[PDB]
Design a protein around this ligand. Structure first.
Ligand SMILES: *[C@@H]1O[C@H](CO)[C@@H](O[C@@H]2O[C@H](CO)[C@@H](O[C@@H]3O[C@H](CO)[C@@H](O)[C@H](O)[C@@H]3O)[C@H](O)[C@H]2NC(C)=O)[C@H](O)[C@H]1NC(C)=O
Ligand SMILES: *[C@@H]1O[C@H](CO[C@@H]2O[C@@H](C)[C@@H](O)[C@@H](O)[C@@H]2O)[C@@H](O[C@@H]2O[C@H](CO)[C@@H](O)[C@H](O)[C@H]2NC(C)=O)[C@H](O)[C@H]1NC(C)=O
Ligand SMILES: CCCCCCCCCCCCCCCCCCP(=O)(O)O
Ligand SMILES: [Cl-]
Ligand SMILES: [Cl-]
Ligand SMILES: [Zn+2]
Ligand SMILES: [Zn+2]
Length: 527
């Protein structure tokens, strides 16, 4: 009734009053008070952190949740406004009828094989310090500010520590030198997450220092080998905050996207840098017959608060994705996709609109590779209508960082080699680790070793989805087999707590949940 305008007026005033930071500072003070009461982190971390966020978090709030149109529609109904914050949305596919489903034929004898190294979640802590308390109250330890191990306890290890601690640069430098046996590689995929988890005290200069430093360190050791990286979530500041392109000004993400451009011009062509400076994604031809696609999965992130304003296909990334897939289908080209956050962890509507595009172009896809989870995992795609036929699989390589309680490690994919008629699909992959227990030991030397090989330990005929599909339900029945998977799940450093059946099924359910908030995919695991 007459309350409808009063709503629109009040929200307008508060939004204006939030232009003035002193009130925002008060509003910020409250968020801190909550931070301590909820024990997200020690108070030292709260104050620093909140001060970073309040400015931008309040901006989106004024532009979205507390916008008069949106808010009034919620309290009073459609009569007075419209509430659409995380409303659902759809993507339109082309008018081309999908060709009959078709799987790749296995490679012929003597066919060349390509090696592709996969690096993700390096997470460099430039403040990392040996001897400091690994058990500190702060969300990140083993550094300056962590203090020192109380009561004659062992401090942070020299190369790293099995705890909430990221890596020292020397351990990262060590990784690059020990790729001899893992190589030679034809190209590399790098799905971001370079900074550490010390978000409560990260200036843009701190962020870009890691970008440049780490980028130069890679290009140096790799040399002529092209590296194709993707955007991670820890790479901007504030973390997870990735304003879509329609946002402009100093609060835009231009500083980051343009900084990446300079650092990566040697690796990428012109048309890819064009789109990268805009939305943090790109595509290009790495070799004849293949088309690589790097996605800015921060436009699917629940954490991206900028999506409150408009969560509907930010940057038109999905529509841009379809353009490329259809083009490759016309050419007959295959496709690999890399991104940081895997689709199973995206926003619901985003994830579903993605699932369907996979289903449509199952024949075009030759690979999907992701990270962010820091553990060794995968996710299988099925036909949309029935979720019965597996049609694609994504690989969730484990992180390089120890964060948390992990052995460092990276991933290497053996794929169909560079030759005409290549399917460009994965044939096998290998995982290498660093056994810190032995490296940080007295008189110990860093030694990278192959933890295992895929088809070897799991005895698979191929790396196609069906093989993995069978693999999942197999482990549901056999206990000892999962205990092995559990071991490799943690890069050779599993937890102490045994994984009970509920832990097991939870883990296994995730392997099928390539789509968010859909219990039907875990129907077969428990009746
Ligand atoms: C990384 O290196 C560490 C080195 O400590 C490995 O942990 C060690 O693994 C050995 C055998 O795998 C185990 O030690 C056992 O000790 C018993 C008696 O305590 C002895 O009878 C056995 O012959 C064996 O030596 C134990 O799990 C562990 N040792 C210690 C001192 O912690 C770890 O397995 C390595 N990780 C990888 C992925 O290779
Ligand atoms: C919310 O956003 C979607 C698309 O994201 C952005 O929205 C536009 C405002 C613009 O910034 C685009 O460049 C971005 O992609 C909007 O839906 C799209 O709207 C455009 C028209 O601008 C249209 O061409 C597309 O077909 C639409 N696609 C979809 C999936 O909706 C939507 O209108 C935005 N809502 C508001 C209130 O701005
Ligand atoms: C009545 C509706 C119930 C739910 C409302 C919840 C919103 C709370 C957010 C308040 C943030 C504090 C900012 C105060 C800014 C004051 C500006 C006054 P001025 O423009 O005259 O200077
Ligand atoms: Cl140190
Ligand atoms: Cl079928
Ligand atoms: Zn990470
Ligand atoms: Zn991440």
């Amino acid at each position: 009734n007459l309350t409808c305008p009063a709503c629109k007026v009040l929200f307008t005033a508060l939004n204006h009053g939030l232009k003035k930071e002193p009130n925002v500072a008060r509003v910020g003070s409250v968020a801190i008070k909550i931070c301590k009461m909820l024990n997200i982190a020690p108070l030292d971390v709260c104050q620093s952190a909140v001060h970073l966020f309040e400015d931008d978090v309040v901006e989106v709030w004024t532009r979205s949740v507390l916008s008069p149109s949106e808010a009034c529609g919620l309290l009073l109904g459609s009569s007075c406004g419209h509430w659409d914050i995380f409303s659902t949305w759809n993507i339109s596919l082309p008018s081309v009828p999908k060709p009959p489903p078709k799987p790749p034929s296995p490679p012929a004898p003597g066919a060349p094989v390509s090696r592709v190294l996969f690096l993700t979640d390096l997470h460099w802590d430039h403040e990392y310090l040996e001897g400091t308390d690994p058990y500190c109250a702060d969300p990140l330890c083993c550094r300056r500010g962590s203090g020192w191990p109380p009561n004659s306890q062992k401090g942070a290890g020299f190369w790293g520590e099995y705890s909430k601690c990221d890596l020292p640069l020397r351990t990262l430098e060590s990784l690059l030198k020990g790729l001899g046996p893992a190589g030679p590689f034809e190209m590399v995929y790098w799905t971001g997450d370079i900074p550490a988890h010390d978000v409560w005290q990260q200036s843009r200069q701190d962020q870009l220092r890691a970008l440049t430093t780490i980028t130069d360190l890679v290009r140096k050791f790799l040399g002529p080998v092209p590296v194709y990286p993707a955007v991670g979530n820890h790479e901007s500041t504030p973390v997870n905050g990735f304003p879509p392109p329609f946002i402009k000004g100093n609060q835009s993400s231009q500083w980051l996207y343009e900084a990446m451009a300079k650092a990566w011009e040697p690796w990428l062509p012109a048309d890819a840098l064009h789109t990268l400076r805009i939305g943090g994604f790109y595509a290009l031809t790495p070799r004849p017959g293949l088309r690589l696609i790097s996605l800015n999965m921060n436009f699917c992130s629940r954490e991206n608060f900028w999506l409150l304003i408009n969560s509907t296909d930010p940057a038109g990334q999905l529509q841009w994705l379809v353009e490329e897939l259809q083009a490759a289908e016309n050419r007959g080209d295959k496709v690999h996709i890399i991104g940081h956050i895997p689709p199973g962890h995206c926003l619901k509507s985003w994830s579903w609109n993605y699932y369907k595009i996979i289903a449509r172009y199952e024949n075009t896809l030759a690979g999907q590779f992701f990270g962010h989870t820091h553990v060794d995992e995968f996710e299988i795609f099925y036909d949309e209508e029935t979720l019965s036929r597996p049609l694609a699989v994504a690989f969730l390589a484990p992180s390089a960082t120890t964060f948390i309680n992990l052995n460092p490690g990276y991933r290497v994919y053996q794929i169909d080699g560079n030759y005409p008629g290549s399917s460009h699909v994965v044939l096998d992959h290998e995982t290498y680790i660093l056994n810190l227990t032995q490296a940080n030991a007295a008189g110990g030397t860093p030694s990278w070793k192959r933890l295992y090989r895929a088809r070897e330990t799991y005895g698979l005929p191929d790396a196609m989805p069906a093989s993995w599909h069978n693999l999942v339900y197999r482990m549901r029945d056999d206990e000892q087999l999962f205990q092995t998977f559990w071991f490799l799940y943690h890069k050779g450093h599993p937890p102490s707590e045994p994984c009970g059946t509920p832990c097991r099924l939870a883990t296994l359910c995730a392997q099928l949940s390539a789509r968010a908030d859909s219990p039907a995919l875990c129907r077969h695991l428990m009746p």
